[PDB]
Structure formats: C-alpha cells, structure tokens
Amino acid sequence: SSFRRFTRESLAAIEKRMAEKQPRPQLDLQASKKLPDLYGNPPRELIGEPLEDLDPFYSTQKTFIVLNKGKTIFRFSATNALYVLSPFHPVRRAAVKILVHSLFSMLIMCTILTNCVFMAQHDPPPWTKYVEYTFTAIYTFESLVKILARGFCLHAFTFLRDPWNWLDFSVIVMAYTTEFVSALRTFRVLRALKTISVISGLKTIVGALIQSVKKLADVMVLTVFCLSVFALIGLQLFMGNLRHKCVRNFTELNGTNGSVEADGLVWNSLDVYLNDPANYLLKNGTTDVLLCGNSSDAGTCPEGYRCLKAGENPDHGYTSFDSFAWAFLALFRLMTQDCWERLYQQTLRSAGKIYMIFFMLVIFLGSFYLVNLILAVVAMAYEEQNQATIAETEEKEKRFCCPLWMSIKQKVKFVVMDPFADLTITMCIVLNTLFMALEHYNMTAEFEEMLQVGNLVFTGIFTAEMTFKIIALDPYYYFQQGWNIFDSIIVILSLMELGLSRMGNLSVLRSFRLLRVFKLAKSWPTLNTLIKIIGNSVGALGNLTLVLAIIVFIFAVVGMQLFGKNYSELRHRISDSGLLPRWHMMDFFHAFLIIFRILCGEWIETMWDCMEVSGQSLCLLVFLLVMVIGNLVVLNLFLALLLSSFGKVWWRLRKTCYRIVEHSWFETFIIFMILLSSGALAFEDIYLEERKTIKVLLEYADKMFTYVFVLEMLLKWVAYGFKKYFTNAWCWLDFLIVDVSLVSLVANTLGFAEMGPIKSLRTLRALRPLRALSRFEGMRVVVNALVGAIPSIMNVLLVCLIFWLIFSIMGVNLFAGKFGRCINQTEGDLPLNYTIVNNKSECESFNVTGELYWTKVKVNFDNVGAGYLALLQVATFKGWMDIMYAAVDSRGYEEQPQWEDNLYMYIYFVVFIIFGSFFTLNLFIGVIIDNFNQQKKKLGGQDIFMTEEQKKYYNAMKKLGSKKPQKPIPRPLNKYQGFIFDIVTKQAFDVTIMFLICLNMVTMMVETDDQSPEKVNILAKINLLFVAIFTGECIVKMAALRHYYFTNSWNIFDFVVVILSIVGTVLSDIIQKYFFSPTLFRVIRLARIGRILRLIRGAKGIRTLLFALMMSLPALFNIGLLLFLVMFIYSIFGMANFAYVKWEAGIDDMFNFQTFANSMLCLFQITTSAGWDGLLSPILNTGPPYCDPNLPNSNGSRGNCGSPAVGILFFTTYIIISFLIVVNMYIAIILENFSVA
Ligand SMILES: *[C@@H]1O[C@H](CO)[C@@H](O[C@@H]2O[C@H](CO)[C@@H](O[C@@H]3O[C@H](CO[C@H]4O[C@H](CO[C@H]5O[C@H](CO)[C@@H](O)[C@H](O)[C@@H]5O)[C@@H](O)[C@H](O)[C@@H]4O)[C@@H](O)[C@H](O)[C@@H]3O)[C@H](O)[C@H]2NC(C)=O)[C@H](O)[C@H]1NC(C)=O
Ligand SMILES: C[C@@H](OC(=O)c1ccccc1)C1=CC[C@@]23OCCN(C)C[C@@]12C[C@@H](O)[C@]12O[C@]4(O)CC[C@@]1(C)[C@H](CC=C32)C4
Ligand SMILES: C[C@@H](OC(=O)c1ccccc1)C1=CC[C@@]23OCCN(C)C[C@@]12C[C@@H](O)[C@]12O[C@]4(O)CC[C@@]1(C)[C@H](CC=C32)C4
Ligand SMILES: CC(C)CCC[C@@H](C)[C@H]1CC[C@H]2[C@@H]3CC=C4C[C@@H](OC(=O)CCC(=O)O)CC[C@]4(C)[C@H]3CC[C@]12C
Ligand SMILES: CC(C)CCC[C@@H](C)[C@H]1CC[C@H]2[C@@H]3CC=C4C[C@@H](OC(=O)CCC(=O)O)CC[C@]4(C)[C@H]3CC[C@]12C
Ligand SMILES: *[C@@H]1O[C@H](CO)[C@@H](O[C@@H]2O[C@H](CO)[C@@H](O)[C@H](O)[C@H]2NC(C)=O)[C@H](O)[C@H]1NC(C)=O
C-alpha cells in the first residue's frame, strides 16, 4: 500500500507540498540501512523501481526511494539530473536499476581487488597498459552511472554531496590527467580506499575511527606541549654534546700559517684536520665514533686521544640536540621508546652519568604517563560509542545386514559418548604434544626412530577415534559443531603428510598436529577466552581488522614506488659493507615488512636508511603518517578486543620482652638496621680489595647485622607465641633470610668456607633488602595487591606457555642446526660465502691454520628449551633482529647461511607476533584488569595501591579541586588604583599575557649550537625586554590588589617565577662581570621554563588531565617504592654474578655490572624492557673463540666468561617482574582518569 510506482501526479503532489511549505528524519529510513518489516516486503515487480518517499521529513522536498532484494533503503534525487534528465526518463530508470543491483557492487569489488594485485608488482610488464586502460574505463563507467542517476552537485542528495563520492571523482579525473618524475603515479594507490566505500560495513568503522581521534584534542595539545617543554629542557642541557669525539692528539707547528701535524702526517689547517673522519676512534665492535666528555662522569678516551667538540653528528647526523627541530624528533623518539637506549647511552657517554635523572623524567612524565593517557582516552571514547550502539538495539526491541549395521551402530555409540573415552583422548592429546616436544638438534638414530614411530601410533589412534565417531552417532550428525569439524581436517591433514612422506623431501605439515592441543579448551576456561579473542577479531571485529589490513597494504605500496627506485640505485649509502640492505623497499614483500616493523614500534631505525637514500623531507612525512595512523587503528583494535571479550618466671620475662618488642623505639631501630644493612650491600664493588679499611669494616658490620636480627627473632619468639610467629607470612620471610645469614656465618667460623654450595649461598645475601617489605605500609599494600593476582597470573602463564609451545616446537622443526656459521676469527664475526665453505664438514676440512670456528647464534632454535628464549626475544621485540637475520638465511641442516636464502621465513616470525605477542598480550591485560576489578569491589570500592593515611590526604586534596567561584575583589578607591584595576581584571589583559608567553616560548626555540655573537646579543636583549615587561605587569597587577596575594594560587606562582627571572636576569649580567660558571650557567638559563608553565592556567583541558596525574601521584609512589626495591635487589645480584664478564655489545666500559652506579644504570634501562637482549649476549657465550676462561681476576674469580644458566634466569625473571609492576602503574592512572572524568 505504502509502496507504489512513481507517477507524474505524485511528483506534482510533492510540488504542491513544497508549495505550501514555502524536525528530524527517521533513523530506520536512512540510506544504506535495512527497511523494517512493518511496512511490508516490497513486491518483486517493485524492487529496483522508483517509489514515493516514506519519511515525511523529506516529503516536502523532491526525493524518492528504491530497494533491492536485500531491502536496503536507497534515497535518490527527484529533481532533474544534469538539468535534462527527468526522474521518469527510461535511461535514468535503467541507470538507477543498475545502481542498486548487488551484482554491480560485486563487479566493482572484484575490479578493485584485481587492481590492488596489479599495483603491488614492482617493475610491471609492458603489457599492463591495456589493464590500466580497462580499469580506467570501468571506473569511469561506474562513475558515469552516478552522474546519470543522481545529478552532479545541485540538488540535496547528489553525487558530489557525500564526502566518500569525492574520492571516485578525484580518481577518474587524476587518471585521465596522467594520460593527457614518474613518481606521481603514487596517487593511483588511492583506488584501494574505494574498498571502504563499496562495503557499507567498512564505512561506519572509518567514521568511528574519526570520532575516536576527534576526542583527543586536549590530549594531543598536552602531548605537544609536554614534548615541546621537555625539548627546550633537553636543548639547553645537551646543546652540542653529541658531537663530542675522541679526536687524535695533535701538535701545532711553529709558524707555517698555523699548520697542524699528526703523528707522521701534516694537515694544512686545524679545521681541515679535525673534520677528517680518519683520526677519530671507533667504538669496540661497532662502527661508531666513540663519544667522550670533560666531565668527571662521562667517558674517557684511551691514551693518545683527546676529547674535542667538533664533529658531524651521531647516527648519520639525525640524532642531535643542537636545534629545537632535532630536539623534538630526538625526544618524540623517547616518547615512543623506539631505540631510546641508543640515545640513553650516547647522552650519558657524552654529557655525564648524572644526566640519567633527565631520562627518568622523560620516560615517566613524557613516555609512560602520556602514552597511557592516550590509551586511556581511546578506551573511554570506545566505551561511549559502545553504550550508544547497544542503546540503539534496546529502543528497537521496545518498539517491537541392515539390522546388524544398526546393532553395531549403537554399540560403538555407547563407547564413543562415554566420558572416559573423551578423557583418554585429551590425555592422548597431552602426551602427543609432549612426546613430539622431545625434539632437539643433536639427535641419534634410535631417538629419531622412536620419535618417528611415535608419530604413526598417535596418528593411528586419532584416526580410529575419527573412524569410530563417524559411525557411532550418524555420518551427517558427526559434522555438527566445529569441534568435530576441526578434528576431521587436522586428522586428514596428517594423513596427507604421512602419504606424502614417501616423496616428502620438504615435510613441514607434521608441525600442524600441535593444533590438536586446542581441544583442551573444553575444560580450560582461559584457553576458551583466548579462542574467543581470536574469533572476535575475525568475527564481530572483522571490519576493523579489514581496515587495518587495507591501511597496511596501502602504506606498503605507497613506499614501494616512492622509494623503490632510490633504494636500488643508492644501496651503497645504506649497505653494511657491500651487500643489499636488510630492510629495503624495492620489493613489495620487503615494503610490507617495513610497515609491519613500524607497527611493532620500530620506526627510526629504518627512517635513517630511507632519509639517507630518497629524501629527508618526504621520508619524514610518510614514516610519521604510518606511525600515527597505523597505531591509531592498532590501538583501536587492541582496545576493542579487550573490552568486547572481557612458672611465674616465664610469664614475667615474657611480658617484659613483649613491651620492648611492641615499643615504637624498637620498631624504628630495626628499620634503621634494615636500611643500613641494605646500604652496605651496594658497597661491595670490584674495588673492595683495594680499600683495605673498608673490607674489614664491612665484615664487622655483617657480624653486627646478623647479631641484631637474631636477637630480634629470639625476642619475638619468647614474647609472641610460636604459632603466632609461624602463622605470619611476613615473619616467615624474615626467618628464611636470617637462616641463610646464620648458615653462612656458622660455616665460616667452622672452617668450611670457600666451598661449592656455601659460596653459592653467600650470593643469596642480596635478599637482605626484602626485609623492608613488611615495614613500610606503602610497599606492603602494593605487595598485598600482587599476591592476590598470583592465581590469575599463573593461569595466564600456563595458557601462554601452551600457546608458545606450538610455535617453539614448530620453530624447532623449521630451524634446527641451521643457525651455524663458519666464521673466520682473523677478520671478525662475519659468515663466509658457500663458494669457499659450504657446510660444517668443509669448515673443519680447511681447519688447518686454526682460524675457522664453527660458531652459532647465542639465541637459536636448537631445542624447545632454547626455542622458548628465542620466542621471548621475538615477542618482546628485543634482539629479534639477529634471529630473523639468521633464520631467513638458513640453507639446510648444518649448512652455511646465504643472504635472504629461504626469505619467506619472515612469515613465520610475522605470524607469531600477531598471535603470540598481540592476542596473547590482549589476554593477559584483560585477565589482570578483570582480576584487579574484583579486588576493588571486594575491598569495598576503595583504591588497592593506597594506604590509609594516603587515602585521607587524597580525599582531602580531591575537595581542593572543587570549583567554587569566589566573589569579585572590591575595587580599591584610590582612583589610580581603581583605574589600573579596571584594565587588569579585564580578560583581554590575560590574552595579552598569554600571547606574550607564546612569544617568549617562540624566542627560546631560536637557540642553536651555531650561535654567532650577534645572534646571542639580540636574543639577550629580547629576553631582557620580556623579563622587564613581565615584572612590570606583575608590579601593576599586585599594586591594584595589594592585599589578596594568598588567594588565586596561580597569582603566587607568577610572583615567584618573576622574582626567579629577576634573579636570573641580573645574575647573567653579573656572571659576565664575575667568575664564569662552568655548568651552573646552564641551570639558571634553563630555569626559564617557568614562564612556559604559566599556560596551565588558561587551558582547561590541560589542567584537568594534569589534575589526574596529581590524583595518581600517591598511588604511583607506592608502586614505585616496590619497583626500586626490586631493582635494588637485582642490581646486587648482578654485581655478585655478572662482574668480570667480557665487554661486548650491550656491556661497554661505562654500562657494566662492576659498580652499583653502573649496574643501576643498566637495570633502569631494562625496566622499560629495552636492550635487555644486548646485555644478555655477553653472558650467554662461554669458551673460545668468544670468551677466554682461565683469566686472572682481582676478586678471587677467574675467567671472563658468562653463565648461561643464571644469566637467562636473571634477565627473564626481571623482565616479567618489572612488567607486572609497570602494569600496576598503567591501571592506577586509568582508574584515576576514569574517576576524574
Ligand atoms: C679450528 O681450529 C682451531 C684450532 O685447533 C679450533 O680452536 C680450538 O677449539 C677448541 C674446541 O674445539 C678449543 O678448546 C677449548 O679450550 C678451552 C680452554 O681455552 C683454551 O684457549 C685459551 C686461549 O684463549 C683462546 O681464545 C682467545 C679468545 O677468547 C684467543 O685470544 C686466544 O688466542 C685463544 O685462541 C687458553 O686458556 C688455552 O689455549 C686453552 O687451551 C676449554 O675451556 C674448552 O673446554 C675447550 O677445550 C680451543 O681453545 C680452540 N683453540 C685452540 C687454542 O686450539 C677450532 O675449534 C676449529 N674449528 C673447527 C670446528 O674446525
Ligand atoms: C607489550 C608487548 O609488546 C611490546 O613490547 C610492544 C612494544 C611496542 C609496540 C607494541 C608492542 C610485550 C612484548 C612481550 C612482553 O615483553 C615484555 C615487555 N613488554 C612491554 C610486555 C610484553 C607483553 C607481556 O604481556 C608479555 O607477553 C607475553 O606474551 C605474555 C605476558 C608477558 C609478560 C610474557 C613475557 C613478555 C611479554 C609473554
Ligand atoms: C620512568 C618510569 O618507568 C616506568 O615505570 C615505565 C613504565 C613503562 C614504560 C617505561 C617506563 C617511572 C614510572 C614511575 C616510577 O617508577 C617506576 C620505575 N621507573 C624507573 C621510574 C618511574 C619514574 C619516577 O620518576 C617515579 O615516578 C613517580 O611518579 C614520581 C617519582 C618516582 C621516583 C616515584 C616512584 C617511581 C617512579 C613515583
Ligand atoms: C592512510 C590513507 C589515508 C592513505 C594515505 C596515503 C598518503 C600517505 C599518500 C597518497 C598519495 C601520496 C602522494 C602521491 C604523490 C606525491 C608527489 C611527490 O612529489 C613528486 O612530484 C613525486 C616525486 C618527485 O619526483 O620528486 C611527493 C609526495 C606525494 C605528495 C605523496 C605524499 C603521500 C600521499 C599523499
Ligand atoms: C608442573 C608445572 C607447573 C611446571 C611448569 C614449568 C614451566 C614454568 C617451564 C617454562 C620453561 C621451562 C624450562 C625451559 C627449558 C629448560 C632447559 C632444560 O635443559 C635443557 O634441555 C638444556 C637446553 C639448552 O641449554 O640447550 C631443562 C628444563 C628447563 C629448565 C625447563 C623447565 C620447565 C620450565 C621452567
Ligand atoms: C681469515 O681472514 C684473513 C684476513 O683477515 C684471511 O687472509 C689472511 O690474512 C693474513 C693476515 O693479513 C695473511 O697473512 C694471510 O696471507 C691471508 N691469507 C689469505 C691470502 O687468505 C685468511 O685467509 C682467513 N682465514 C682462512 C680462510 O684461512
């Protein structure tokens, strides 16, 4: 009834309606949406035909509606298209019929996919010109349909009205313009964006992505403000420090126009001499110029070398603090924590070791807090649209031999359904995934046969279960749920591998039997959650994954044809020695890998190579665009998955010691000893034997510490009950520590020192700091929080252990003994060509001069135990470079590697990261969030990481943030004071002050290392004007008030910053006429960022976000008290174990474990899980030709080798322990951010 064929009388009626016409359309009637069944199913004769409009909102105007077989509402234009085409024209009727046809949409979709394939081919064949013409013809043909059906721009719903249709018009007009330097074809890849327009599902997701980034202006402004403020701090502190180089010593010849000579050569001038790169000193191992510093903490050049400022720069010239432009980039990289340890070591080496305080604040105030603030908002923004989407569903519902065969069929059915049969199958699955885990590199004939024989017996059992199941219930009913389907495909996949094994030279399908371990999800709940996370990404979140896949492909082909030509021609400017670059862009597969590497968080490493090849300006835009856009989609996908898927004497003495134990003076006495005993541990450096008076003093102190603590335990034992002491977990912790100390002391006095087990027990003195946990309530409440999560953490670790067991066994099968390289020690650690040494047999054949060592990668796939460490390094993105490089080079069993031979081994590492590092991490954070949410509810809706006293202060300080607008200040009746009051209280005065802050902020970015005296004087004069006017505006605003400086707390911040600026601006003039400050002048110069910090008053969004950090300050302090204690404990472990190790990649002469100061620097670097692979490598190696045992050492030890056993345990546990504590910090801000919203 409602639907009818369009008629001219109906058009005239709509005209009359518009006539007397000269407040919201219905959601259910919007375009590209399904029509409700209330109006009725359109007849087959009316589908694809013009029908009158249904919504009264558009009834006034000339609009009409069509529907397809799928009943999608389409609103076209009824006004004359192109001024000649009436809506009733037969050609227009044919055009609109083909526009709504679902077959037409599939035609465009298939064409785009074919075009996307043809755009990924570098150096296309010359016959593709017709294909480009055909794609141009098709795209113009479908574009002409829109013009022939809707108009061009004139009437409401038209072609160039929806923003997405501009893309099609731009593509066709640009394609024809090209048909009417060759790098301008990069615009043709925009045809891949048309996929989003074709699929209606993808369009809404893109709209959701824009909304997510729209709710980020306050955070993005704060992020830019924080980075710019920190850049000015870094600029004024390390201005030109990175240019320090160990220039060779020289002497100046007398006369001869000031010529300078080297040891044997002569240079014309000092400028020419020093700028030469052949007289510097390269760092050991790497090809890096060794930085230095005149400070007492920075590095030192060896004999014959001196520290001089002049030089080019580190990292080809792109890593410097000389200008604000470089300072911003060098600190945005710190914000992302992409290779930040390289800048961490370079700045400490050049400036000094004390400057790690600056890196601590940048990593916290700029990286840890700000990135988490970004992630907190995206989760908040998604929760807002998720609620609305669910709300739109709620309102929709409110409105609305045969008898023998049968006899044996039921008999086997009885056996199959029996629960013991299923349990044995699960037990068989567990054994099968464990028997085949007994795979290593150096096998034997018997072991390989036993493992091979075990394959058929396990495969044969599964076939019998499948054979019995297909006949038991029903052949058709057997398929049913996918659990039965999944078993069928896997069991027949193994049979294909076994049948192929007769000719199976390349057998890898046997590694797919591990997928049967997923059958354990029936009983395991956590395994089910992991499957649901993966299923949601391909299921309900299919569109979001498709958008990410589409975006990654586009950025892969954008860079392939933009930098592909330059990479091939200028490969020598980025080649290691003489070969191709490892990460180039001349091929699509390598182009995609760089995009994937950028998504993983490593961008600047490949940015330097591209900037040195193609162009600095262009490479900066593309690499940063994929960094912002790529992470925005990935973070949206990661957060979407997480939220969607989730006698009287005895009595008398007992009372006396009870009183003394409970006395407060006793409690602080023990705390004093706990801190002192922990402090003396760090004193045992490698120079202890040199200091004769400190080694005996520490030994006496150790005796006193173990005598006081024993007395304390005895007093508690006598006073408190035996059950009371042993029922307290904290008291048990102290009991073990003292027991270890007592055993070591009693063994030393017994004359049984320096033995095997006793000497290992002395190292366990590093657990002495653990006694401080039970005393400070700030740390005890944090420990109480992580103890409650131990059952939840253990469940996730088992699932990740099973998930990583599949990849480790599969990785062992793919690579086992293929990581061996026959290196030549005379040259260096460089694999040789196969034209000389082909395998291990040939390497030993030429082993006549004793210089060919068949070494192997320290972290490799030789067995499941060794494979677990490699997966950990790959998943953590630390040290994975040396794994993929040695894996995409494998050339068979015990064969010499070749450049990119077996190149597609990169796919194995990419898939693992998507599954074992992305989805696995998503499961862990989801469980931890769920667990700690339960603890908050269990505790009574109170913060978990906060003490009782801190709660009072935080609650009291929370009320301080209440906005209570006070009454206006009375006008002073001094005429002149009243006049200045009127011109000051006006808000326009604050705008002028705010404008002056930006000008002062701008004039500090002009600072550069190459500062001429004329530029210095002009800037000094400009600063003098700024400090004068600011004092003037402070002296007139205060003059009007004169009695209420206490109120408006921002009015005291500017008063002290002006006084500080007044002190600074007069000391600088004094300093020029007084003793020159070597480094104190930098501080007073740098103390001017207070003016920049005055912008908080005028920014509401910035102030609110900063208020959340102040809320989370007491919570973060408690968590950080524990992390530093753990870092302190591990540092003492490092000095006792990893001292006197060979200096190598991660262990320089300044970042070793010899001293507490040096070990503290290393552990802070590993706290962010950065560069832990580089530090682990010098411990893993043992024996020649890498290490050299039987080497004399000062502290009794011998040999500079490493300990692979404890070296792996030390770094693996600390990486995990730090991550849990860091995660505790990530959510503490989020909960505070959610509450403050
Ligand atoms: C090719 O041919 C060479 C020479 O025959 C082989 O090199 C030897 O390989 C064996 C193992 O197969 C090594 O034996 C090991 O020796 C350890 C004791 O240390 C020995 O060398 C120490 C000297 O230091 C060496 O390394 C440093 C660098 O760290 C160099 O600067 C030195 O020049 C030395 O090369 C000394 O203490 C002393 O010489 C020791 O003998 C021992 O702890 C191990 O258990 C093992 O027995 C041997 O050291 C290697 N070199 C020597 C001296 O012969 C090479 O393996 C062959 N490669 C193949 C596979 O073809
Ligand atoms: C964050 C994540 O990815 C990145 O690092 C990353 C960096 C830049 C851009 C994008 C991503 C991690 C890499 C691996 C990891 O490494 C430790 C340090 N990181 C910070 C934490 C992660 C995640 C952790 O849950 C953990 O992953 C596990 O699979 C499960 C539990 C885990 C503790 C186990 C051991 C190491 C893990 C194994
Ligand atoms: C730098 C940063 O590291 C990370 O946690 C981190 C996490 C993820 C990625 C990268 C890095 C820190 C986060 C919190 C911290 O504790 C953790 C350990 N680090 C080394 C030191 C920081 C910073 C410190 O200034 C400190 O922050 C405070 O808020 C103020 C002073 C502080 C000493 C107090 C106690 C602990 C702090 C509390
Ligand atoms: C994630 C979605 C929105 C896709 C984003 C794609 C853009 C990052 C690409 C698409 C087209 C590209 C442009 C295509 C062509 C050129 C011309 C090029 O200059 C030339 O004249 C060619 C090179 C030369 O000869 O020097 C500079 C880069 C630029 C603007 C490219 C910049 C990067 C663009 C905008
Ligand atoms: C009963 C359940 C709770 C046991 C859980 C054990 C797991 C925590 C796994 C994870 C990693 C495993 C380790 C991985 C590798 C090895 C090396 C393995 O020794 C070798 O085969 C040498 C390998 C080499 O160095 O080449 C001995 C077992 C061990 C310590 C494994 C012991 C069991 C571990 C700790
Ligand atoms: C290992 O590397 C060296 C080069 O560092 C190869 O060349 C030898 O180098 C030494 C020292 O310069 C010369 O004295 C020899 O005459 C060189 N031998 C030659 C010509 O090969 C050395 O050959 C390599 N080791 C091998 C392959 O035995």
Give a brief rundown of this model.
The PDB classes it as membrane protein. The protein is mostly helical and 1237 residues long.
Description:
The PDB classes it as membrane protein. The entry lists the keywords Ion channel, Sodium channel, Voltage-gated channel, Sodium transport, membrane protein. It forms a monomeric assembly. The entry is titled "Cryo-EM structure of rat cardiac sodium channel NaV1.5 with batrachotoxin analog BTX-B". The protein: Sodium channel protein type 5 subunit alpha,Green fluorescent protein. The organism is Rattus norvegicus. The chain has 1237 residues and is mainly alpha-helical. It folds into 8 domains: 173 residues, no CATH class; 103 residues; 81 residues, no CATH class; 108 residues, Four Helix Bundle (Hemerythrin (Met), subunit A) (Up-down Bundle); 103 residues, Helix Hairpins, CATH 1.10.287; 128 residues, Voltage-gated potassium channels. Chain C (Four Helix Bundle (Hemerythrin (Met), subunit A)), CATH 1.20.120.350; 123 residues, Voltage-gated potassium channels. Chain C (Four Helix Bundle (Hemerythrin (Met), subunit A)), CATH 1.20.120.350; 139 residues, Orthogonal Bundle (Helix Hairpins), CATH 1.10.287. It contains 46 helices and 12 strands. The protein has a 4-stranded antiparallel beta sheet with strand order 1-4-3-2, with no helix packed on it. Helix 13 packs across helix 15. The longest helix has 44 residues. The radius of gyration is 37 Å and the shape is globular. The two termini are 51 Å apart. The site of a molecule of 5 linked components (NAG-NAG-BMA-MAN-MAN) has 14 residues, from helix 32 and strand 12. One copy of the ligand C[C@@H](OC(=O)c1ccccc1)C1=CC[C@@]23OCCN(C)C[C@@]12C[C@@H](O)[C@]12O[C@]4(O)CC[C@@]1(C)[C@H](CC=C32)C4 binds next to helix 33, helix 35 and helix 46.
